[PDB]
Design a protein around this ligand. Sequence first.
Ligand SMILES: CCCCCCCCOCCOCCOCCOCCO
Ligand SMILES: [Mg+2]
Lengths: 368, 7
Amino acid sequence: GSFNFGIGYGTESGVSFQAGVQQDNWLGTGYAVGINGTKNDYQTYAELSVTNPYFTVDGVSLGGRLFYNDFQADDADLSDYTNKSYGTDVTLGFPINEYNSLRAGLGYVHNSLSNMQPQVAMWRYLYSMGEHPSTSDQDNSFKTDDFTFNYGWTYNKLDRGYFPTDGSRVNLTGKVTIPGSDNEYYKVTLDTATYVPIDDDHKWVVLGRTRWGYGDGLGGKEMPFYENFYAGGSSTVRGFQSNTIGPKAVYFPHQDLSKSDDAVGGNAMAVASLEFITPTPFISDKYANSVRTSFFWDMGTVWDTNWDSSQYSGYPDYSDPSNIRMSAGIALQWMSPLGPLVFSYAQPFKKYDGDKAEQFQFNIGKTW
Amino acid sequence: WNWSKSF
Ligand SMILES: CCCCCCCCOCCOCCOCCOCCO
Ligand SMILES: [Mg+2]
């Protein structure tokens, strides 16, 4: 077994902490047991892990999870709400070959929403569920119990985990609600990274990233807004404040409407990045294996497919997917004594109404 | 930073 403690920092996350403990073999059962928790400016998460890598003789794994999660949306630069949740996951893992693995699982989650600041898109989802709270009060509550079928696919042919120079990584994760759940929806996420070395020593690499998200309701319901996709920040569209890209809250009057610059995410998302990895100027060859310079072009959009631009014609059409943000800049990664580090400086050359800018972004990791 | 201590 082992335990660990992490400390880190990010521009969007603030000072972050992590700790965990794992019993390598829980009293002869062969199921590894673990307890992990992490915390940053807007999220507190904890779990109990219970996994066995050889549930069957030929590799199939059996995984259990029991989790608690506290999410402060205002501190993740969204319109304000509080989501406290807990649940369990049972996941089977099937390695198809050397570069592919599949996973299927059944999950239960309880979400307890509170402290929701009235806005059109959020309330629209509440209306689809049959919930009609006051539009002038921030002292509300919404609770749901959901059962989900979760599938996943990971392709990994990366030459190296730290600082890849060749190969691709693809991760597709989906879920759908099982009838009987309070929510009725599906949700799909696709992430890709492709490294192409353009020189023999693999110091000059071209990197293409894509990230896609789509989900909608079933049966006249919508997707819960706390399941929304976002874009902007250090890992999606650099130079943009975290989560700023996409629809903005259209606030209900307190006790007619008000446009805002508070992003609310959305149920469709698309991000793409083109990055040129180079050797690092002004650093010795002794410290090459531990640093990575790159120059990038980032873009992304987020939209709300159920935005009703008829009822709200005086506002921007938030269902519009074509308002594509763009940025360009230089990044620096360093495997520092304080852990994996990442500087980035980016100029958002293409931005839209209410998009907030974060030119300098900085991250020290706490997991590696 | 991450510190890992096998017991
Ligand atoms: C009271 C309703 C109980 C129904 C329980 C069904 C549980 C498992 O459902 C299987 C659904 O099958 C999914 C097949 O996918 C086809 C989707 O069809 C939608 C066409 O638009
Ligand atoms: Mg606050």
